[PDB]
């Protein structure tokens, strides 16, 4: 049957992929300066940080409403038989819940998937699902592959400060570094859809080494790896990291790079960089 993919703006997919692939995007919002802005279309991470730097109130974010999703599902079903809706971790956002409430309006026609990921971690799964669907694979085959990716993928990232994670409430296990991190650089990951601690290093360089150490360990035995790099601020840290990965001798066949969306950046904060990755 005809299956259409829907995701939310936090999947942080470049416009040059999502648009032509027929992926529909439901936006999330950033609350700043007393106003509400749509992720990607009306605000950037740089603008948010500039406002903080200037003494403004911290940014907050909002998930889409059930009707935001229902309008998209209704439109998609006008020319499709089923909708596969992929979203940021249910433990990080109420987005999945809103999607599920909207899905009830089209019983049998919408499958909502909690990817337990964020940013391009969600985006890479959307792209993998699309790749399979365009070849002609069944919903089942695709859902089975998505479950494999949920269980088996890689992610490491660092941030300039843990303050945005703390204030926004998504710090999760990284809270262990609050009273123990000092001046060191934190290395974080996600497990079961929740942020967790994954080491600390003296200096940006050592931090990158620790991330490549983890990557090599995870990469063992894999013949085809696709990586997705993300950043907020300037691209140098992530660029050096991507270079070190592409020169590691590991079989990385894809190494896409994009800036984090304003919604994700509102929680990670400035100087965020890292990468998600999976194999096939
Ligand atoms: C790969 C680098 C990015 C890693 C991102 C993990 C850090 C947690 C992100 C939290 C985003 C929370 C968005 C909430 C949106 C909302 O429902 O209001
Ligand atoms: Zn309704």
From TrEMBL:
Zn(2+) binds at residues 67, 105. NCBIfam families: DegV. The keyword Cell membrane does not apply. PANTHER family: DEGV DOMAIN-CONTAINING PROTEIN DR_1986-RELATED (PTHR33434), FATTY ACID-BINDING PROTEIN TM_1468 (PTHR33434:SF2). Keywords: Lipid-binding, Metal-binding, Zinc. Transmembrane segments: none annotated. This is DegV family protein. GO terms for molecular function: lipid binding; metal ion binding. SUPFAM superfamilies: DAK1/DegV-like (SSF82549). The lineage of its organism: Bacteria, Thermotogati, Deinococcota, Deinococci, Thermales. InterPro entries: DegV, DegV_C, DegV_domain_contain. The keyword Cell membrane does not apply.
